[PDB]
Amino acid sequence: DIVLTQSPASLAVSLGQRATISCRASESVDIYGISFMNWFQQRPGQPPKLLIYAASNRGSGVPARFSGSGSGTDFSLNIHPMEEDDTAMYFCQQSKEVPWTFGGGTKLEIKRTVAAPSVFIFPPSDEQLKSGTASVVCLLNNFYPREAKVQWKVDNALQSGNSQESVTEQDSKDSTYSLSSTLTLSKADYEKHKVYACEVTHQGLSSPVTKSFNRGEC
């Protein structure tokens, strides 16, 4: 298959500046001077919308700030100047030969100034514990950029494999994110330990923040 390497997976650009999204094909997508590379925009809940066809041609009604370039194996979609309704997923897609293949996608978001998260920790409820499972939740509220390291420790033992993270979409008014990390243990494993800690590293914090509790302490 023609494999498309799309970069970056996540792109933050300031409104008014240029967003450049790239796609490398594993082999040429050219036939007779035409480069069969398409670009799509996808908004949440909606189907893909064709922006650029055959590498460099704007679709009908597509705004002039979208443009495409490239040939052979190397292609870019350029959005300049970026506007707020350009936040979306973008995908390249080769139309040279079946099987039709797509890049992995780029999520384009709005770049804003750094904002440190507020961090909170929630012990499992008494109601859930009697059910046989314990969920411990660490919340990072209203931060930017999205990159953060959230590390669970149980009596100082670094946890791995037993937590899942979820992140909100960028806030429409302040452009920040919030994130949950949820540690899942058996009721039995939870009652084996005393100190539950969530350590958060983020560019907005001069020193990584630990929130912790002693099991059963109001």
């Binding site: 189907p47 919308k49 055959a54 679709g59 079946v98 099987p99 039709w100 293949t101 996608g105 949820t182």
Partner: protein, 222 residues
């Protein structure tokens, strides 16, 4: 005006079958190559199957992931293309789109709104709702966070409101995660004045349309 309309998605168990249908309007359908493309819960696009024209002997193509399990066909008289899916697998879960032409040189294309497929051994089940109680240790700044953990439901989605929709500012309802058990979970959180914690009542209203259930949970200091 050209429109493509998909139908036939829904819940199914692994090993089961479903047939999707796509009806085209406003186009000379017999002249159009038709493809199905799916989108994972991860939000990526994957081409599934294509069928060509009568003049091309209705040539069909399949992604290796679906070869021998899916069958694409068309009925030019009804401007429709179909995807029969057999021996379904969890990884076939996703939104399925009908599109044309996808391949070759084209200055315009068409896509439906999509139809959803969820392949799972899980039974439909409404969520258990647990409080994320505001901490009894003080905050430096006088804002407190609290929430509801909405756990062990199937299929998606749930909706969460706070105080019957009166509380919307500061609310974050996270995307669900599929747990190793095959059931989904998420939390909804809100930030409130810590000085309201003894005065203001906070209740999360959790609706799960697939089970036709609603759960209200009051969230108090422990």
């Amino acid at each position: 005006e050209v429109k493509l309309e998909e139908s036939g998605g829904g819940l199914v168990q692994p090993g089961g079958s479903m047939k999707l249908s796509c009806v085209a309007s406003g186009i000379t359908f017999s002249n159009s190559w038709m493809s199905w493309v799916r989108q994972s819960p991860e939000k990526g696009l994957e081409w599934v199957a294509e069928i060509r024209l009568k003049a091309q002997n209705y040539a069909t193509h399949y992604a290796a992931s679906v070869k021998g399990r899916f069958t694409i066909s068309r009925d030019d008289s009804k401007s429709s293309v179909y995807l029969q899916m057999n021996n379904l697998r969890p990884e076939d879960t996703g939104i399925y789109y009908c599109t044309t032409p996808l391949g070759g040189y084209f200055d315009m294309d068409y896509w439906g709104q999509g139809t959803s497929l969820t392949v799972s051994s899980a039974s439909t089940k409404g969520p258990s709702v647990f409080p994320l109680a505001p901490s009894s240790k003080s905050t430096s700044g006088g804002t407190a966070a609290l929430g509801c953990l909405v756990k062990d439901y199937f299929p998606e989605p749930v909706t969460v409101s706070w105080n019957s929709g009166a509380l919307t500012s500061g609310v974050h309802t996270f995307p669900a995660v599929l747990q190793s058990s095959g059931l989904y979970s998420l939390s909804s959180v809100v930030t409130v004045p810590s000085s309201s914690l003894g005065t203001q009542t906070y209740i999360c209203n959790v609706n799960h349309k697939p089970s036709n259930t609603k759960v209200d949970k009051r969230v108090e200091p422990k």
